[PDB]
Swiss-Prot record, chain A:
Function: Forms part of the ribosomal stalk which helps the ribosome interact with GTP-bound translation factors.
Protein's UniProt name: Large ribosomal subunit protein uL11
Any coiled-coil regions, as ranges: none
Family the UniProt entry places it in: Belongs to the universal ribosomal protein uL11 family.
Lineage top rank: taxon: Archaea
Quaternary structure annotation from Swiss-Prot or TrEMBL: Part of the 50S ribosomal subunit. Forms part of the ribosomal stalk which helps the ribosome interact with GTP-bound translation factors. Forms a heptameric L10(L12)2(L12)2(L12)2 complex, where L10 forms an elongated spine to which 3 L12 dimers bind in a sequential fashion.
GN (gene name): rpl11
From Swiss-Prot, chain B:
Stated family: Belongs to the universal ribosomal protein uL10 family.
Quaternary structure and interacting proteins, as annotated: Part of the 50S ribosomal subunit. Forms part of the ribosomal stalk which helps the ribosome interact with GTP-bound translation factors. Forms a heptameric L10(L12)2(L12)2(L12)2 complex, where L10 forms an elongated spine to which the L12 dimers bind in a sequential fashion.
Protein's UniProt name: Large ribosomal subunit protein uL10
Function: Forms part of the ribosomal stalk, playing a central role in the interaction of the ribosome with GTP-bound translation factors.
Superkingdom of the organism of origin: Archaea
Entry's transmembrane regions: none
Note: Has been called L10e and L10E in this organism; in this case 'e/E' is for E.coli-like, not eukaryotic-type protein.
Residue runs in coiled coils: none
From Swiss-Prot, chain C:
Function according to Swiss-Prot or TrEMBL: This protein binds to the 23S rRNA, and is important in its secondary structure. It is located near the subunit interface in the base of the L7/L12 stalk, and near the tRNA binding site of the peptidyltransferase center.
Pfam families per the UniProt record, alphabetical: Ribosomal_L6 (PF00347)
UniProt keyword annotation of GTP-binding present: no
Family from the record: Belongs to the universal ribosomal protein uL6 family.
GO biological process: cytoplasmic translation
GO CC terms of this entry: cytosolic large ribosomal subunit
Entry protein name: Large ribosomal subunit protein uL6
Entry keyword annotation includes Membrane: no
Keywords assigned: Ribonucleoprotein, Ribosomal protein, RNA-binding, rRNA-binding
Gene Ontology MF annotations: rRNA binding; structural constituent of ribosome
Species the sequence originates in: Haloarcula marismortui (strain ATCC 43049 / DSM 3752 / JCM 8966 / VKM B-1809) (Halobacterium marismortui)
Length: 70, 29, 172
RNA sequence: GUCUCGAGCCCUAGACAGCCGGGAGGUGAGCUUAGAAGCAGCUACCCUCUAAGAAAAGCGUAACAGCUUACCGGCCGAGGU
């Protein structure tokens, strides 16, 4: 039902393509309040019990794309 | 006596109060 | 060394000299187990394979005698089953059991029938496209099963194109 | 091939091997690209669940699928390397 993680990051960023070299070349940006909205959406997709660990799975795709958190 | 086996027994004894060999060892305690 | 083998209830085994006879409901198997300083005896209801020597050569045979006796126990009870499937590409092969020998006719277009003799008490049953070799003596059954596959040997032409022949499907 | 002597390491908290079971999700990573989803190539190689389970070691596919490897559990039981 709920679309993939790679698509949900590109909507609230404004950028389409990633990078030639991840983590070494920073492209997009996010904030803490913006990751708390993506954590509410995926409930049957993630295996995490709490909302605390549900955010870590989204961050575990972000830093390996070129997204810096402020 | 491996260090990870000692840490595992202390993790099982923690979830009794609150491998089948490591469970038996933890129950005997 | 000494290895004691407990005899099953369905089985009863007698022994004289170097020969061991193992009887059961599926039949009887007599084998000769002869090697230097290895004594195989029947102690009531256990088979004892012992030797005063512990060298690699003696140890190899003690372990071989063990598996030979354990296999005889299985043979006289549940028996030994080898399943085979007859495959052909162009020429319709005619496999038939004619007496104490299994005959394969019209193999690869041959006018002359290919045949092999069945080893002892081994029974070969055929049900259309399938063949099932069975009996108490694994030595006899294993060989008769092998003999059938070896019978369609082709050394002259490519095996990958000319694949016709009965092949072993099930190993026990 | 076989005999003999030494050293290190692992083992009844169960070793070596075999067999059974599990080999999971985020996500078919991103870039490349019509596509590439462990496995053409470039870069990274991160965290959840958990007793394990690689951003995949080897095959396999046009690409999937499919088969096992790592890794965990079970059966077994004495030495093993
Ligand atoms: Mg030629």
């Amino acid at each position: 039902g709920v679309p993939p993680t790679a698509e949900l990051i590109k909507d609230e960023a404004g950028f389409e393509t990633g990078s030639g070299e991840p983590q070494e070349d920073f492209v997009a940006d996010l904030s803490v309040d913006q990751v708390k909205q993506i954590a509410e959406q995926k409930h049957p997709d993630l295996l995490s019990y709490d909302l605390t660990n549900a955010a870590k799975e989204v961050v575990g795709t972000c830093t390996s794309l070129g997204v810096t958190i402020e | 006596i491996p260090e990870w086996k000692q840490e595992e027994v202390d993790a099982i004894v923690e979830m009794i109060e609150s491998r089948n060999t490591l469970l038996e060892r933890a129950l005997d305690d | 060394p000494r290895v004691e083998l407990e005899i099953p209830e369905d089985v009863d085994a007698e022994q004289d000299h170097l020969d061991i006879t193992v009887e059961g409901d599926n039949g009887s198997v007599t084998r000769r187990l002869w090697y230097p300083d290895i004594d195989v005896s029947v102690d009531g209801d256990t088979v004892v394979i012992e030797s005063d020597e512990d060298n690699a050569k003696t140890m190899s045979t003690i372990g071989t005698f063990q598996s030979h006796i354990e296999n005889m126990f299985h043979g006289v009870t549940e028996g030994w089953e080898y399943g085979m499937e007859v495959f052909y590409s162009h020429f319709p092969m005619q496999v038939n059991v004619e007496g104490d020998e299994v005959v394969i006719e019209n193999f690869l277009g041959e006018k002359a029938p290919r045949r092999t003799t069945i080893h002892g008490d081994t029974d070969v049953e055929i049900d259309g496209e399938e063949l099932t070799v069975s009996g108490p003596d694994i030595e006899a059954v294993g060989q008769t099963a092998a003999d059938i596959e070896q019978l369609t040997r082709i050394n002259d032409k490519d095996v990958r194109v000319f694949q016709d022949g009965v092949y072993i499907t099930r190993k026990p």
